[PDB]
Amino acid sequence: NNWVLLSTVAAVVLGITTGVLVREHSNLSTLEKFYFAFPGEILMRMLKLIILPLIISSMITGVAALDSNVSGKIGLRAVVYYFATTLIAVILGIVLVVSIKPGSTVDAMLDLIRNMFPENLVQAAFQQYKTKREEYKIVGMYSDGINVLGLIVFALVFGLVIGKMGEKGQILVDFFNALSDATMKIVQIIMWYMPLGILFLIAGCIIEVEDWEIFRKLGLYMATVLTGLAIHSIVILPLIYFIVVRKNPFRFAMGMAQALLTALMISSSSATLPVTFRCAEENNQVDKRITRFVLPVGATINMDGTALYEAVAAVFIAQLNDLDLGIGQIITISITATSASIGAAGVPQAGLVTMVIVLSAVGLPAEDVTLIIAVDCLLDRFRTMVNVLGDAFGTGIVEKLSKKEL
Amino acid sequence: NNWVLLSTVAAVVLGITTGVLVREHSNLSTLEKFYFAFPGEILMRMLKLIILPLIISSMITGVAALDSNVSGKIGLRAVVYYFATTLIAVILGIVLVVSIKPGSTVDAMLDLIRNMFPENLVQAAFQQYKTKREEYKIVGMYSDGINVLGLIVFALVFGLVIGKMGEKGQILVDFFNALSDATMKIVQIIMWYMPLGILFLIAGCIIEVEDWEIFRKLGLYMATVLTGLAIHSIVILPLIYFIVVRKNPFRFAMGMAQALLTALMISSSSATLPVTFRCAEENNQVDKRITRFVLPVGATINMDGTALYEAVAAVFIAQLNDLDLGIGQIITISITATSASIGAAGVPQAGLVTMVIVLSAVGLPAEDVTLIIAVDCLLDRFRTMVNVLGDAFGTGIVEKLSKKEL
Amino acid sequence: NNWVLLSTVAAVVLGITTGVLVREHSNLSTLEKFYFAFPGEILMRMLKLIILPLIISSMITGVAALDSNVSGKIGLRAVVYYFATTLIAVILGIVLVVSIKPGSTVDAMLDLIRNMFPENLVQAAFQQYKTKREEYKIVGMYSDGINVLGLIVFALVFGLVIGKMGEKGQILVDFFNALSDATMKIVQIIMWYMPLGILFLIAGCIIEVEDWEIFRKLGLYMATVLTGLAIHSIVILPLIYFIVVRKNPFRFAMGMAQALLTALMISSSSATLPVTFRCAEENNQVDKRITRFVLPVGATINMDGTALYEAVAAVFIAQLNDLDLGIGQIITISITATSASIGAAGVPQAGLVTMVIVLSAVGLPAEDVTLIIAVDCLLDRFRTMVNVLGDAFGTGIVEKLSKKEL
Ligand SMILES: N[C@H](CC(=O)O)C(=O)O
Ligand SMILES: N[C@H](CC(=O)O)C(=O)O
Ligand SMILES: N[C@H](CC(=O)O)C(=O)O
Ligand SMILES: [Hg+2]
Ligand SMILES: [Hg+2]
Ligand SMILES: [Hg+2]
Ligand code: NA
Numbered sequence A, B, C: 001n002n003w004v005l006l007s008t009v010a011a012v013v014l015g016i017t018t019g020v021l022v023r024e025h026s027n028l029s030t031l032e033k034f035y036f037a038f039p040g041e042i043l044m045r046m047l048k049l050i051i052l053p054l055i056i057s058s059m060i061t062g063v064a065a066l067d068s069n070v071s072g073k074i075g076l077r078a079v080v081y082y083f084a085t086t087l088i089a090v091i092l093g094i095v096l097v098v099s100i101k102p103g104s105t106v107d108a109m110l111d112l113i114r115n116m117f118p119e120n121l122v123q124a125a126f127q128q129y130k131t132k133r134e135e136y137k138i139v140g141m142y143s144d145g146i147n148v149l150g151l152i153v154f155a156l157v158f159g160l161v162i163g164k165m166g167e168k169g170q171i172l173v174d175f176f177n178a179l180s181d182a183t184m185k186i187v188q189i190i191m192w193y194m195p196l197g198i199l200f201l202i203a204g205c206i207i208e209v210e211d212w213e214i215f216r217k218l219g220l221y222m223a224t225v226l227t228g229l230a231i232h233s234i235v236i237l238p239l240i241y242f243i244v245v246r247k248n249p250f251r252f253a254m255g256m257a258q259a260l261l262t263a264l265m266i267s268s269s270s271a272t273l274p275v276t277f278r279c280a281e282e283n284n285q286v287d288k289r290i291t292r293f294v295l296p297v298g299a300t301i302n303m304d305g306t307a308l309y310e311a312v313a314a315v316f317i318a319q320l321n322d323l324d325l326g327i328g329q330i331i332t333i334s335i336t337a338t339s340a341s342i343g344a345a346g347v348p349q350a351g352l353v354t355m356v357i358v359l360s361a362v363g364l365p366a367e368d369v370t371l372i373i374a375v376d377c378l379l380d381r382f383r384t385m386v387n388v389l390g391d392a393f394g395t396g397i398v399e400k401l402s403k404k405e406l
């Protein structure tokens, strides 16, 4: 029988029970609380390790497969769908957080473009560029944190060059095609340890909860994120699928249910990629030619739920700080949330790593992310589920939009 | 019709007009002055990004093509020509700057050798090694700045090993041959954006000029650099070509005019490399076998005008500081200027990145480079033009010196 | 005739004579003492440069050759032998140092596992992770020092994936097979300069000796390390070879004498790898299929003398500090010494780079390594000789244990 979904479901329920029991029956110091989540920490180390080779190989392989000029229309449709759906998600999140009200910008805007074109490839693999005004000259320095956005841009450009280069670049096509397969196999190996890591990751989160009052304080913020993700994944995505594809969207989701369930459990759109491939290709009978580009590329660029979560969380933290947001502040939040979703990886907690960028877009303190850390696991799992669902609908939508080409 | 040369010439003239008009009619603060050069800044980020893959692939591919022992004579002639002509340029620059007078060394000497053999390959991709006396033990630490010299040495050694390794290393030959072609294609893609970047780079430089008095103060220094570059490119280089090649050198230059013009506009010996290839192969009917090694390798090692500029500028800054230079100080300046030209990339402003090394050779402050920043663009464009011209003459000279081998 | 062994023997004796004469007849300041060892320093820079490509290619190539499931038994036998013999060495060293008595642990224990799975591949190439308690939250930061252990784990996992991936990963097999051959050729090129570097490395060590009193102070510690290494290489290793292989072990050592002699001279188990290959394959008629995996992999993981030296030196420094070691302290020293031997490279002085980890396991100051630096060269040469001998016996032992498979 299948072991992944079950093992992970058992891990999640065991994590809930372990967290509850340990938090109440026992009293652990900060030390023991940190040491109790060590297996989950090691899982994060392994997943963050696979980020860089996975992204580089996936982007290069995906865009190099679409070598033909006619095949490039498939890529054009995919990128416009990714941007359009992510923009819709950001708009929906901002509107909802403004309505419910649960609670140096140019430097960050230019830092987005600066990080889109890193000065060094090797440095971009593990470092990012940030500029700050001072006396008013601009001083920019590199800080830790993989430059996922710059790596993505170079990988897409490099893969396009390799595909157009023809047989001269066939060695590089094969090199990166094998490197993507090998990285996916390593992710599958990580899947063996994932259940235990997820157990101690979920349990570790519950232990850090102090007196259950923080969930009440963040309940309205949780409601805003959850309602936004729900609307996006149950109305907007099915609706757009119906307009482009004259087929039942909910049947499409039911055919891709195992992938969404796995995403909602492991909270990784890249680790669930094999499941996403299998579901779309087998149950939905989607063409392999468009899937092999839409799914792996969209697993990293197309992150709609993360974009919605970034927008809602940034506005909510601002509202907590009692900083009234103007039109330009809303616009800059929208752009940085779109960039943050693009620049965030498909790993658990990737949402929090790029959250500081959107927070600093409006001058908010970097450490203000701690205001929503406590309830991040539940929101992270859901935003990932919808993240994969966005790509899931894109596969069928791109297939319909490219029927003649295939 | 051709678009590059024209587009870039229009960009340069538009930059002059934009700079003049903006500097006089309008008054911009330091902030707006920095933000006005942002498109040029992004061009620098893209060009600096391509530095590392371009150099690594170019060196490995160039020296791996000359696999045969007989073919290794071609490489030997090329390297001796590069060193000899660069040494002549340094001597000419030092003599001129001493005559006109426009105005811890062992640690730097040993740091050259230390950086020739970096401790880490990945660190050398983005960091450099420097040692300083203190209490007198020596303390060495790594600092930011790509170790271009160490990467060059490893790439040459690695490429030699790959070429001699025969069919066992053929996969690596092909891998790096495709990687060089792909990097050149990415540079060609950058050429699309270059015109706008050059416009805002030239315009941005003029804005930073305060009251036009700095050009008068540096006029004699500009004259020394310009006369030195002129002499080197119109007397020494044509003369040596005549001794080795019994042909008209100025006709050779007229056949390679489009490459020199493009270099004088874009200020990059590596970005103009496709033009240099086309001119030498088509107009001058130079053999492709020797061109494919002399041009790409010489685009990074053989930088004669930069060597002349480094020597003249280092001595000129010293003269400004009223530090009387001894014989040993002149000798150490010559060696570090040769190393700096070798270690500087083929990008706009590469001359200034390695200038700190030669300045610190004589104990001068690192921030003293600011004394010649204002007039750097004009000198940078000319020194690049002669840089490409040095390689241009080397192609024909190496062909003549290897007539029997071909 | 052969030049390596002789040239290096002449270099060692010339280093002894140069060190003695320079130390006594002349009086050199700290400056001149440091500058006198510069050629040896450059040798260290070159060898440390080759560490990373050598290890990565060696591990991947070694474990990818054993693609077959039946062939994986060979790898299983090799790894269990490496661990078992290293554990025996650590136990022997601890017992001897406790008997003779020549003189935050959980954080280091968890740091071993954290570094086994680095967060970034590129960062692991040149940086390591360390955590420290403070106010008690845990704060972890990355520091300089190549993460050899994390690179080894990823390389082994990656190579296993590539081997199992079949013909899809054949391009990567060939890429890393050529990269290993090229790296070995570069090491052979370094062998040309090694004699001079070893001369100034040995001479430089003798100069730093102050008044010959430090050797007397560390004489008992030197005796403990030397007796432990002797016992391990003349009793334990020959005995275990006899149990598994019903052949004369000392004849096996006499057949591999040139490799042990070269190791005792150059103090590098990786630079002597070509000699180890030649001796085992020619004189001992060992099968090439098992040698090509046991030797290159064991040159980096299987370091028994280093493990013994790490344990003895850590306990000896602790004894100097008058810190009474409990059972748990001994156990944590044993584990960290095993990890340190695994994580240390096959270069001269690799023992000292990972010594700080085992020292900090028991809270000892990092700079306490200076207490045994003076006499490190002699101990380093011997521990390397036995390091290669451990792998030497493993080749024959693994061959006997896999007779049916071959
Ligand atoms: N959970 C990640 C991204 C995030 O957490 O924001 C994903 O797979 O989409
Ligand atoms: N301009 C660079 C080098 C420099 O600026 O010094 C070149 O292409 O030669
Ligand atoms: N000498 C190294 C390791 C060490 O010095 O500890 C070796 O080759 O084994
Ligand atoms: Hg949680
Ligand atoms: Hg200028
Ligand atoms: Hg010594
Ligand atoms: Na989207």
Ligand code: NA
Pocket (backbone or CB within 6 Å): A269, A298, A299, A300, A301, A302, A303, A304, A387, A388, A391
């Ligand atoms: Na996704």
Ligand code: NA
Pocket (backbone or CB within 6 Å): A299, A300, A301, A302, A303, A340, A341, A342, A343, A344, A345, A346
């Ligand atoms: Na993303």
Ligand code: NA
Pocket (backbone or CB within 6 Å): B081, B082, B083, B084, B085, B086, B087, B302, B303, B304, B390
């Ligand atoms: Na030259």
Ligand code: NA
Pocket (backbone or CB within 6 Å): B269, B298, B299, B300, B301, B302, B303, B304, B387, B388, B391
């Ligand atoms: Na050049």
Ligand code: NA
Pocket (backbone or CB within 6 Å): B299, B300, B301, B302, B303, B340, B341, B342, B343, B344, B345, B346
């Ligand atoms: Na150069």
Ligand code: NA
Pocket (backbone or CB within 6 Å): C081, C082, C083, C084, C085, C086, C087, C302, C303, C304, C390
């Ligand atoms: Na061992």
Ligand code: NA
Pocket (backbone or CB within 6 Å): C269, C298, C299, C300, C301, C302, C303, C304, C387, C388, C391
């Ligand atoms: Na070894």
Ligand code: NA
Pocket (backbone or CB within 6 Å): C299, C300, C301, C302, C303, C340, C341, C342, C343, C344, C345, C346
């Ligand atoms: Na080791």
